[PDB]
Amino acid sequence: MEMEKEFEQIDKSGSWAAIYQDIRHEASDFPSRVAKLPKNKNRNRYRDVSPFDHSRIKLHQEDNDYINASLIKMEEAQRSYILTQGPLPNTVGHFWEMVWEQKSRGVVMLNRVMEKGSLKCAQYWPQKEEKEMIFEDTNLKLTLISEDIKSYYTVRQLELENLTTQETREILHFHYTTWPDFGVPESPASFLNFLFKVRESGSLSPEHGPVVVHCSAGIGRSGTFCLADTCLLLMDKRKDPSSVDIKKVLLEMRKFRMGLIQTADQLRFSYLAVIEGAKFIMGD
Ligand SMILES: O=C(Nc1ccccc1)N1C[C@H](O)[C@@H]2C[C@H]1CC[C@@H]2O
Decide: 253 and 262 in contact? Cβ < 8 Å: no
Q: How was this structure determined?
A: X-ray
| Domain count along the chain | 1
Decide: 281 and 235 in contact? Cβ < 8 Å: yes
Residues 6+ apart with CB under 8 A from 136: 93
Structural element, H or E, at residue 251: helix 246-253
Decide: 262 and 251 in contact? Cβ < 8 Å: no
Ligand 1 centroid – CA 80 distance (Å)? 19
Mapping DSSP to helix (H, G, I), strand (E, B) and coil, where does residue 161 land? strand
Structural element, H or E, at residue 169: strand 167-176
Q: Which domain holds residue 209?
A: 1-284
Q: What's the alpha-carbon Rg for the chain, to the nearest Å? A: 19
Decide: 266 and 16 in contact? Cβ < 8 Å: no
Burial annotation 237-260 (CB, 10 A radius, 16+ → b, else e): eeeebeebbbbebbbbbbebbbbb
Q: Which of 271, 252, 201 is nearest to 80 (CA)?
A: 252
Atom of ligand 1 nearest to the CA of 103: 7
Q: Which of 254, 210, 259, 204 is nearest to 229 (CA)?
A: 204
Strand partners, 158: 144, 171
Strand partners, 175: 109, 154
Decide: 218 and 83 in contact? Cβ < 8 Å: yes
Decide: 188 and 272 in contact? Cβ < 8 Å: yes
Q: For ligand 1, which residues put their CB under 6 angstroms from it?
A: 103, 105, 169-170, 208
Decide: 96 and 75 in contact? Cβ < 8 Å: no
Mapping DSSP to helix (H, G, I), strand (E, B) and coil, where does residue 206 land? coil
Which parts are annotated binding residues for substrate? 181, 215-221, 262
DSSP labels for 104-146?
B-EEEE-S-SEETTEE-S---S-SSTTS-EEETTTTEEEEEEE
Breaks in the chain after residues (C–N exceeding 2.5 Å):
none
Ligand 1 centroid – CA 263 distance (Å)? 37
Tell me the backbone φ, ψ of residue 200, rounded to 5 degrees: -60, -25
Angle at 207 between CA 204 and CA 210, to 5 degrees: 45
- Ligand 1 mutation pick, 140, 167, 170, max ligand atoms within 8 A of CB: 170
Could you give the residue numbers annotated as active site?
Answer: 215
CB-count burial class (<10 Å; 0-12, 13-18, 19+) for 118:
exposed
* Residue 271 to residue 269: CA distance in whole angstroms: 5
* Residue 237 to residue 263: CA distance in whole angstroms: 29
Mapping DSSP to helix (H, G, I), strand (E, B) and coil, where does residue 163 land? coil
Q: In sequence order, what E strands does 39-78 have?
A: 56-58, 66-74
Ligand 1 centroid – CA 142 distance (Å)? 14
* Residue 195 to residue 190: CA distance in whole angstroms: 9
Q: What is the DSSP letter of 173?
A: E
- CATH number (domain holding residue 40): 3.90.190.10
Residues 6+ apart with CB under 8 A from 212: 69, 82, 84, 98, 99, 102, 104, 106, 107, 108
Decide: 271 and 277 in contact? Cβ < 8 Å: no
Angle at 74 between CA 68 and CA 79, to 5 degrees: 90
